[model samples]
Target chain A: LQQVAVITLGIGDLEASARFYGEGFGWAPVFRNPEIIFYQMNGFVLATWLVQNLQEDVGVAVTSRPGSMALAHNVRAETEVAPLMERLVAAGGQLLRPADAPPHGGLRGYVADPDGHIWEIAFNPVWPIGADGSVTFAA
Target chain B: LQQVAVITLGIGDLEASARFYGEGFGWAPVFRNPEIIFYQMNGFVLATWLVQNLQEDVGVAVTSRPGSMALAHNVRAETEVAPLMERLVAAGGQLLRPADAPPHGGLRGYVADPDGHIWEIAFNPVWPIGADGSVTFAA
Candidate 1:
């Protein structure tokens, strides 16, 4: 309840989703199995599992769908947005919105991982990224 | 996409969702508006916003639903699990599971935010939490 230890996406295909993340962000797999793939981020874990498997593990009916949630990846520089987004697109993600300025004075856009999970690729001037890849929200 | 900068959950009512998070986790709102509420966590931000507004901002038709993604909140002790679940239920969350020992040798359970955003409350002995509330995934 204090910090997000893991963000688990209920994916349709575990391998495909794994490929998208592994290639798109150059993330290394920390753990894997037939049902789930876990990636170790800077301070937490990001995981993807088959939708049915996750539903069963949580013992809850999967009532809500995917795009209703979004994850943001903040870049260090404004110029970093477009090219990284392009990298994401080449890695089998759908570009929901090309990099552009939002109403809040930051460059941002939306992209969907192969499994329809939305990710916001952004560079917020107010929220700076540290050398250790930590982003403290000052905005 | 290397690090998660923010997590945005699409909710039906912003106020109700905010209260669920605020009381359930004792988290203070770092930034908020009429339609959105943002909570700054250890290394990233967790936010809740109206679903329609989020869909329009992302310029997508919001095809996927909620509960498709899950967030894990790692605790420090196995005994911390049930009490937190009780607080969550008191704060208008739905208890999907009571704390129990998982096959992975950790205490874990599930709860849902007002909008059905699933959160896994867990106490993993291997994942040590720092005094500053950072959890470095050694496992």
Candidate 2:
């Protein structure tokens, strides 16, 4: 196993879900269809697929809800967290957590896409965000 | 709202889930605690947290089951799919699909982590896998 080439979410409304991610994150869709949409990220791909289709394609029961897993987007400045949270809310995401400094350090907040998939808008001083939007942990 | 900085899964057992991923993918944990484990991916972080704690932290009802979203691990060669699937199974993953050529012009298979999070082990000729394990989309 290498890296996650794609993180595919099964959603009810492909178009709305795609819009939520694409517009919310200012990400461009690399591929799009009626049933699926793919976005090229810094190193992998983020995809949203029709729930019914994905269920049949992968031969699994569609059991998981949107918040089963959480994805995070790190920013270079701590000030960016709240505004991004607002942007995400304006783009059809629900602001779950208000941007604030967590006990562990840094600013962080949570927002849910239209389909309820949670995304963390975070600014961790320990992690560096590359100019190209890539992130490297200080290990 | 740049790239995904982290993907965190909710697991029942942190150590078992950590072991499955670490031993299965040759990933060493960059950070660990009693309830969470983090691994440095190519440009992001992969983390696992205790399900109950995650639910409380996210303040959401844990309605989702395990296999809702699928994480794809893209390898450089098609031949690596089958063997990697076997390796994952040996590391305690459940094989959901056998390695085979998909209609989309790639070889792929599905496996479930110990916590039932789904993963697609895939090899796509159209996508280039960099020497540092980064994925480059054709677009």
Best by DockQ: 1
Off by over 4 Å in 1: none
10 residues in a row with least lDDT, candidate 1 chain B: B60-69
Model 2 alpha-carbon drift over 4 Å, by segment: none
| DockQ of each model vs. true complex | 0.66, 0.63
lDDT by residue (A64-117, candidate 1, tens digit) is: 357478899998888989988888888889999988899889899988889888
True contacts kept of 1: 0.73
Kindly list the per-residue Cα lDDT of model 2 for residues B1-139, writing each as its tens digit: 3499999898988767876787887778888889888888877889898888777767667544574589999988778899888888988899888887776878898899998888899989898877766786684
Interface RMSD of 2: 2.0
Candidate with the greatest lDDT versus the true structure:
1
lDDT of each: 0.83, 0.81
